[PDB]
């Protein structure tokens, strides 16, 4: 049983997608994330 697993490299990938309307661009973006099922986490964009 691996310990300190969260301190190592991520080992899963999940594809999600969503869309939404919004009163402002940021609110629309938020709605899209929520619609995709990933609205309440902090996304750290990787490139």
């Amino acid at each position: 049983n691996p310990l300190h697993a969260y301190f190592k490299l991520p080992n899963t990938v999940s594809l999600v997608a969503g869309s939404s309307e919004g009163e402002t661009p940021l609110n629309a973006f938020d709605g899209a994330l929520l619609n995709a099922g990933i609205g309440n986490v902090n996304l750290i964009r990787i490139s």
């Binding site: 991520p10 999600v16 402002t24």
Partner: protein
Amino acid sequence: XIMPPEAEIVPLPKLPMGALVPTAYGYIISDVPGETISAAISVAIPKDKSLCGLIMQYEGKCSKKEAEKTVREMAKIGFEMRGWELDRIESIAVEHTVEKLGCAFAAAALWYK
């Protein structure tokens, strides 16, 4: 993006609120009524399991079908550029027809099993 070697593609798990999730994503926002916007994400998996997968993102003013085809081609090109043997490509896309102000979003979230 880059899928770590040996990483598995899984349906989104129950992420703890506030988690710092490394995510590759494409998105587009539009305030043009009736305009159709889309976003797509693809993951190219190598035959050589010691290698990594390539994650490509796409966004634009086109259909869902067009978005996915484009992003899948982008992943293939990525492998051709590296000269790695492709196992398969996994992808998804979404389109949104703007009413007043809308956003289409697609991503690959990296997390832990």
